[PDB]
Amino acid sequence: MHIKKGDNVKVIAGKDKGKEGKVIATLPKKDRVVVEGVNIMKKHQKPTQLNPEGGILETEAAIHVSNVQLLDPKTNEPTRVGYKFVDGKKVRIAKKSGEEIK
Amino acid sequence: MKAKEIRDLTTSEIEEQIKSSKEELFNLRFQLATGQLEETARIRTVRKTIARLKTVAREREIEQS
Amino acid sequence: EARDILKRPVITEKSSEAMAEDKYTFDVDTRVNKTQVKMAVEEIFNVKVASVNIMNYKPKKKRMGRYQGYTNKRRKAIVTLKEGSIDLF
Amino acid sequence: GKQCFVTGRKASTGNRRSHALNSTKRRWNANLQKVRILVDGKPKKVWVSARALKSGKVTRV
RNA sequence: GAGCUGUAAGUAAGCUUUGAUCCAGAGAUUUCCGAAUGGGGAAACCCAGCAUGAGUUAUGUCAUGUUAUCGAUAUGUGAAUACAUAGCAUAUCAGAAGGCACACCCGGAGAACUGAAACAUCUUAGUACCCGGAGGAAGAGAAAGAAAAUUCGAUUCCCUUAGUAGCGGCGAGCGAAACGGGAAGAGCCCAAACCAACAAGCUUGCUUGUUGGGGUUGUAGGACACUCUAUACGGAGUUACAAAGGACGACAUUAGACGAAUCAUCUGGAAAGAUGAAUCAAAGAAGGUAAUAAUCCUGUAGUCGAAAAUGUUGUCUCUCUUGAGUGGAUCCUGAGUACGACGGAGCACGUGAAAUUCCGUCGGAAUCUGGGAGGACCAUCUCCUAAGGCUAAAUACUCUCUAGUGACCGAUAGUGAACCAGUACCGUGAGGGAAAGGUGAAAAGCACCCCGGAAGGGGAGUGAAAUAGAACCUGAAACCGUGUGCU
RNA sequence: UGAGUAGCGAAAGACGGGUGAGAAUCCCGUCCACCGAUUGACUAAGGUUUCCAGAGGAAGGCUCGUCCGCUCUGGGUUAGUCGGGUCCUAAGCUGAGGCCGACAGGCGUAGGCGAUGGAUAACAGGUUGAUAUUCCUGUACCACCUAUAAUCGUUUUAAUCG
RNA sequence: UAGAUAGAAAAUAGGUGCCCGUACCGCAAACCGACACAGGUAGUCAAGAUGAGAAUUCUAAGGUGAGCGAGCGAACUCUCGU
Ligand SMILES: [Mg+2]
Ligand SMILES: [Mg+2]
Ligand SMILES: [Mg+2]
Ligand SMILES: [Mg+2]
Ligand SMILES: [Mg+2]
Ligand SMILES: [Mg+2]
Ligand SMILES: [Mg+2]
Ligand SMILES: [Mg+2]
Ligand SMILES: [Mg+2]
Ligand SMILES: [Mg+2]
Ligand SMILES: [Mg+2]
Ligand SMILES: [Mg+2]
Ligand SMILES: [Mg+2]
Ligand SMILES: [Mg+2]
Ligand SMILES: [Mg+2]
Ligand SMILES: [Mg+2]
Ligand SMILES: [Mg+2]
Ligand SMILES: [Mg+2]
Ligand SMILES: [Mg+2]
Ligand SMILES: [Mg+2]
Ligand SMILES: [Mg+2]
Ligand SMILES: [Mg+2]
Ligand SMILES: [Mg+2]
Ligand SMILES: [Mg+2]
Ligand SMILES: [Mg+2]
Ligand SMILES: [Mg+2]
Ligand SMILES: [Mg+2]
Ligand SMILES: [Mg+2]
Ligand SMILES: [Mg+2]
Ligand SMILES: [Mg+2]
Ligand SMILES: [Mg+2]
Ligand SMILES: [Mg+2]
Ligand SMILES: [Mg+2]
Ligand SMILES: [Mg+2]
Ligand SMILES: [Mg+2]
């Protein structure tokens, strides 16, 4: 996917539209990603499980990768990504500024 | 153990390594049966090591012909 | 090939009583004979084998959900040692 | 599996026809005769048709 | 190029930027049964020989290789029976076997219901089934052709001729071909005469046989005799015309890479919708994304890309290879053949006036001043030159792979089978043969409390919705209940 | 719908004590009754895990169910001598060559296969929840192998094998 | 016997001896009968009293009380006694 673990992304669709956060996990086979503070779910945790304490646990749920957009390193605006070849190595380029993302 | 190390080993060393790996795998299987093996991935590791050793031995005895 | 003849030890109540009697129970390759079992045990555990009894166990029907099948057939040997001992643990 | 050893002459199929033109299957068999001829330079009793024997074209020995 | 150890969640233990998983080419491994092939056998099992090796004091035990049958080619031995012929023994062979794509092709054998308003000739039909043989196509094929002129010039296939000409208890029905227009096109090799070498009979006359050369036809050709032409100059070729290779190059297939352009607000759980204002387009195909997106993702147009294997091609190489004319003295030009009679069959053609073509049985030519055909037959004329062989393409079909298409189905439809289906189940067996899809955007799959043994439920919570809570979208009718206005 | 209807598949139970949320139906006890050339004990086919232990009660069980030939979890079958193979053959099957036959294939010789028959060395006792002529104890037998051997042989042999 | 070959072994001691089956039901609720079905299913053993007996009745060894019950004690049907 064009989004990668550790990237800083902006949510462009969903309840969290407009939020920014770090990509902390990707699910390539589902085309989904997990972004900090985005798409919080409240799951019912039984205290009877291997974890003694239980209740309602709040954690991020995966979001579809097409709902997050990379932020341009220069302008900090959401941008699509192209690829250049520098000394035979692929480099992700922001299509707004033209700068290497990483 | 990987194919490069196996290809540095000599034929006699390949055979001895196969013997020792088989003995190791056998002890691992016995520990697993008796319930004393927590690190179960060693079994697969050793099985694939044996497979690689036999691959390389066969390659050598093929290129000889 | 001895490590292939012997597959694993059998640990059950009857097998433990046998071990008290100096009889060790193993699952073995379904194709081998009593003599091969004896030689494999003697080579692996450096013991003297007094005798080997052997038996076959049919595949047993087993169910998991809506899927019907069978367990593997088994060949079980009981090796009575003449001299020495085997420590499985 | 009976045919002329020399020419391959064998039976064929056709019809017996009545005056009312009713049809029933029949065969025309070859006029095969068991004779001793030279096969691979050695005598051998084989089936040969009378026509293959005609005019002494097959040597009986 | 960052995750990964399948369905398949879980736990555990782990792997991985020193490049996992994953994708493509190549290779290694590949138990047992099965043609199954050491022998046997009620498939997936049992029991051996031989050689070599492991183990044991030794036996027992084990490992690897090999050992079926037939065929062919060699070697040895060799009965009745003398010579040697059965036979026997050994060695070699990528020799055969068996399967299937319920298709297409060729051949052997070959129904019946049915139609004829009955039924026997006839029809169904040379169909179904069975059997053998294939090939990627098969079959056919370079005139003993079609014809009747200004003749054409192998075969196959399409249109037409034409439901014509004919056939037919002249019933039911069956039903051409030539001409003309098209697709595709390609032509060759033997037998014989004759020459040379070799071997047998030993006229040791010159007869027979093998090999090579020569030769291939209707405008008659060839041998033979003579005259030119050349020793690969030229020409041809592994699709026939003889048959194996090699080098280099190109293209294609089997992974991939790059690939333009959108923001804001409103409603809403969510925007792609609406509104406003923009942008790309060789890209407005399509799918996905929390509703309907050219500009969010995967893509699309366009361009690029291969270590390796495979396929098709081009040039070199390689291999093979003479080509014409004149003459009419002699010679050759396919024999138990053509053909005839009887009995059958095939020809659209049912025996008919029945040519043309095949099978069985019996008889049986001619030899270029020859032989066959023009629908009995004869003459004339005209056209061909049988009784040997090969041959691509245009045609047929689809188990299969790749990319696509549909005024085709949308869960009683569409495959029998959207789902763990040729399953469950039924049958001794051949065989017959189902039912069964949908939570939600996300599992956020209901912590906790309460009644209850549990099941089940009431709250609470998640969620837009639980009135979406597990065959969980919607949820008709039959049918079953509770309450009630009028009766 | 028929309808809370027919039926619930040969029979003798009673009570006490347990267990349990729940008991005519499960466990234990006493008494009673039934078969007893047998409803008892083996065992060949056939079945194929139904066997044992622990747990369960949705469905199955013609009621109930705490129970079960059901569900879940884990177990259980031990052989030189028992039966079969490494022995034999009957009927039958198969069948190298072979004979016959449109094809397919049919028949058949040698030779194989093939028990329902022939041959063939182990018995008593003890033992588990579940195996026992199989495990254990005691005491045997059979085939074979190795070493030492009273004795006999030593190339027409003469001991020995056949 | 044809054949074979220096060597043979009464005894003593020691050792070796594979594969398949083996659970359980098996006149039955586990087999053939769609069923936890009054049917069918080869062979073996089979005590006492009585008796000719493997008949008869009652018992032994051993096993079993049968997978709906509780009442009532009409017609009628069935099985049985007078
Ligand atoms: Mg056994
Ligand atoms: Mg075999
Ligand atoms: Mg009719
Ligand atoms: Mg009619
Ligand atoms: Mg052809
Ligand atoms: Mg008439
Ligand atoms: Mg060629
Ligand atoms: Mg891209
Ligand atoms: Mg928007
Ligand atoms: Mg794009
Ligand atoms: Mg005729
Ligand atoms: Mg004529
Ligand atoms: Mg003629
Ligand atoms: Mg005419
Ligand atoms: Mg002419
Ligand atoms: Mg062709
Ligand atoms: Mg529907
Ligand atoms: Mg269907
Ligand atoms: Mg369906
Ligand atoms: Mg619904
Ligand atoms: Mg009532
Ligand atoms: Mg009534
Ligand atoms: Mg009534
Ligand atoms: Mg009633
Ligand atoms: Mg009852
Ligand atoms: Mg039980
Ligand atoms: Mg019930
Ligand atoms: Mg034969
Ligand atoms: Mg018997
Ligand atoms: Mg028992
Ligand atoms: Mg047993
Ligand atoms: Mg038993
Ligand atoms: Mg019945
Ligand atoms: Mg009987
Ligand atoms: Mg009696």
mmCIF file with all atom_site columns, C-alpha atoms in Angstrom, chain A residues 53-97:
data_model
loop_
_atom_site.group_PDB
_atom_site.id
_atom_site.type_symbol
_atom_site.label_atom_id
_atom_site.label_alt_id
_atom_site.label_comp_id
_atom_site.label_asym_id
_atom_site.label_entity_id
_atom_site.label_seq_id
_atom_site.pdbx_PDB_ins_code
_atom_site.Cartn_x
_atom_site.Cartn_y
_atom_site.Cartn_z
_atom_site.occupancy
_atom_site.B_iso_or_equiv
_atom_site.pdbx_formal_charge
_atom_site.auth_seq_id
_atom_site.auth_comp_id
_atom_site.auth_asym_id
_atom_site.auth_atom_id
_atom_site.pdbx_PDB_model_num
ATOM 1  C CA . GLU A 1 53 ? -9.528  -6.820 35.340 1.00 0.00 ? 53 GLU A CA 1
ATOM 2  C CA . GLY A 1 54 ? -12.238 -6.344 32.727 1.00 0.00 ? 54 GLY A CA 1
ATOM 3  C CA . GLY A 1 55 ? -14.754 -3.829 31.497 1.00 0.00 ? 55 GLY A CA 1
ATOM 4  C CA . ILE A 1 56 ? -15.004 -1.612 28.420 1.00 0.00 ? 56 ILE A CA 1
ATOM 5  C CA . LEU A 1 57 ? -11.639 -1.295 26.638 1.00 0.00 ? 57 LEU A CA 1
ATOM 6  C CA . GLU A 1 58 ? -11.181 1.585  24.187 1.00 0.00 ? 58 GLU A CA 1
ATOM 7  C CA . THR A 1 59 ? -8.831  0.988  21.261 1.00 0.00 ? 59 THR A CA 1
ATOM 8  C CA . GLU A 1 60 ? -8.362  2.018  17.647 1.00 0.00 ? 60 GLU A CA 1
ATOM 9  C CA . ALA A 1 61 ? -9.993  -0.128 14.976 1.00 0.00 ? 61 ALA A CA 1
ATOM 10 C CA . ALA A 1 62 ? -8.574  -0.448 11.487 1.00 0.00 ? 62 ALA A CA 1
ATOM 11 C CA . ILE A 1 63 ? -9.713  2.024  8.830  1.00 0.00 ? 63 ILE A CA 1
ATOM 12 C CA . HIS A 1 64 ? -9.756  1.560  5.072  1.00 0.00 ? 64 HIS A CA 1
ATOM 13 C CA . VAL A 1 65 ? -6.529  2.807  3.525  1.00 0.00 ? 65 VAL A CA 1
ATOM 14 C CA . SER A 1 66 ? -8.298  4.973  0.939  1.00 0.00 ? 66 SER A CA 1
ATOM 15 C CA . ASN A 1 67 ? -9.711  7.147  3.761  1.00 0.00 ? 67 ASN A CA 1
ATOM 16 C CA . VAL A 1 68 ? -6.312  8.424  4.915  1.00 0.00 ? 68 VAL A CA 1
ATOM 17 C CA . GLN A 1 69 ? -4.005  10.644 2.897  1.00 0.00 ? 69 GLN A CA 1
ATOM 18 C CA . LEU A 1 70 ? -0.319  11.369 3.373  1.00 0.00 ? 70 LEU A CA 1
ATOM 19 C CA . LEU A 1 71 ? 0.556   14.878 4.525  1.00 0.00 ? 71 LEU A CA 1
ATOM 20 C CA . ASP A 1 72 ? 2.977   16.857 2.392  1.00 0.00 ? 72 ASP A CA 1
ATOM 21 C CA . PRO A 1 73 ? 6.231   17.274 4.369  1.00 0.00 ? 73 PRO A CA 1
ATOM 22 C CA . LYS A 1 74 ? 6.614   20.894 3.239  1.00 0.00 ? 74 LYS A CA 1
ATOM 23 C CA . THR A 1 75 ? 3.086   22.322 3.118  1.00 0.00 ? 75 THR A CA 1
ATOM 24 C CA . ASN A 1 76 ? 1.511   19.762 5.497  1.00 0.00 ? 76 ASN A CA 1
ATOM 25 C CA . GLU A 1 77 ? -1.361  19.424 3.021  1.00 0.00 ? 77 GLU A CA 1
ATOM 26 C CA . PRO A 1 78 ? -2.817  16.027 2.068  1.00 0.00 ? 78 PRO A CA 1
ATOM 27 C CA . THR A 1 79 ? -1.134  14.758 -1.069 1.00 0.00 ? 79 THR A CA 1
ATOM 28 C CA . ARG A 1 80 ? -1.055  11.790 -3.380 1.00 0.00 ? 80 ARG A CA 1
ATOM 29 C CA . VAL A 1 81 ? 2.178   9.847  -3.809 1.00 0.00 ? 81 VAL A CA 1
ATOM 30 C CA . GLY A 1 82 ? 4.298   9.143  -6.859 1.00 0.00 ? 82 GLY A CA 1
ATOM 31 C CA . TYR A 1 83 ? 7.541   7.227  -7.233 1.00 0.00 ? 83 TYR A CA 1
ATOM 32 C CA . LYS A 1 84 ? 10.939  8.235  -8.570 1.00 0.00 ? 84 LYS A CA 1
ATOM 33 C CA . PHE A 1 85 ? 14.036  6.116  -9.164 1.00 0.00 ? 85 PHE A CA 1
ATOM 34 C CA . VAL A 1 86 ? 17.161  7.509  -7.489 1.00 0.00 ? 86 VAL A CA 1
ATOM 35 C CA . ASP A 1 87 ? 20.294  5.429  -8.124 1.00 0.00 ? 87 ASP A CA 1
ATOM 36 C CA . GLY A 1 88 ? 18.049  2.476  -8.871 1.00 0.00 ? 88 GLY A CA 1
ATOM 37 C CA . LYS A 1 89 ? 15.988  2.835  -5.683 1.00 0.00 ? 89 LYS A CA 1
ATOM 38 C CA . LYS A 1 90 ? 12.298  3.705  -5.478 1.00 0.00 ? 90 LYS A CA 1
ATOM 39 C CA . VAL A 1 91 ? 11.534  6.924  -3.597 1.00 0.00 ? 91 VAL A CA 1
ATOM 40 C CA . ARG A 1 92 ? 8.069   8.075  -2.540 1.00 0.00 ? 92 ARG A CA 1
ATOM 41 C CA . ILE A 1 93 ? 7.435   11.642 -3.694 1.00 0.00 ? 93 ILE A CA 1
ATOM 42 C CA . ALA A 1 94 ? 4.658   13.969 -2.602 1.00 0.00 ? 94 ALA A CA 1
ATOM 43 C CA . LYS A 1 95 ? 2.782   15.101 -5.699 1.00 0.00 ? 95 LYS A CA 1
ATOM 44 C CA . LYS A 1 96 ? 2.172   18.567 -4.232 1.00 0.00 ? 96 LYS A CA 1
ATOM 45 C CA . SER A 1 97 ? 5.703   19.593 -3.222 1.00 0.00 ? 97 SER A CA 1
#
